[PDB]
Amino acid sequence: QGIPEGPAKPGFLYTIGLSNKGMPGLYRLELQVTKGSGKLATSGLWNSSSAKEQVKIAFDYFKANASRISGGSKVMEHDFHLHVVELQNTGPL
Amino acid sequence: QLIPEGPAKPGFLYTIGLSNKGMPGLYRLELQVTKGSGKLATSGLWNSSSAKEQVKIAFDYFKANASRISGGSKVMEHDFHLHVVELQNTGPL
């Protein structure tokens, strides 16, 4: 274990950023969306306070701009589970 | 050959409003939907510019919020005609 050709499943993407040691690293973000109450679960974030804070900030902003992006989809009626996979052993992002 | 019992066809509704004289009156709004380029036509509104502006505002709001209400129907691919049927001769609304 830790980018294939073709589209992945919805909610799945790849990212690149400087790790805590300053070395660039590649990571995979996978999101599972189910019928829920607007709750968010986090996994694979290296159990880092900074990464969890970033994810909370992103979720709050997404909830704030639901109308612009969703165009009618009610975020509060669904729950999200976001998981992080390290692909190059570079360190936490 | 005012509101018959049983479900009317899609695009037909009833409204009540104070006419240009301020007296209450009932109006049947009739919508004809055809395959087209999103154009809007109107008739029977008793030649009032205010009614045309109201209908234009409503259709523009329909354009903006198609995703929230229609949930997948494309307004641009259908032309609409709105007709006003005054059933009480109360005056233009």
Describe the protein in words:
The structure is cut from a larger assembly and holds two copies of chain A (93 residues). Chain A is α+β, with helices and mostly antiparallel strands and 93 residues long. Chain A has two helices and four strands; from the N terminus they run βββααβ. In chain A, strands 1-2-4-3 form a four-stranded mixed beta sheet, covered by helices on one side. In chain A, a hairpin with a 5-residue loop joins strand 1 (12-18) and strand 2. The longest helix of chain A has 16 residues, at 49-64. Chain B: This is Protease Lon-related BREX system protein BrxL.
Between the first and last Cα atoms of chain A, what is the distance in angstroms?
18 Å
Strand line-up across the major sheet of chain A: 1-2-4-3
The total of helices of chain A stands at 2
Quaternary structure classification: part of a larger assembly
PDB class: antimicrobial protein
Keywords: phage restriction factor, AAA+ protein, antimicrobial protein
Entry title: CryoEM characterization of a unique AAA+ BrxL phage restriction factor
Chains A, B: Protease Lon-related BREX system protein BrxL
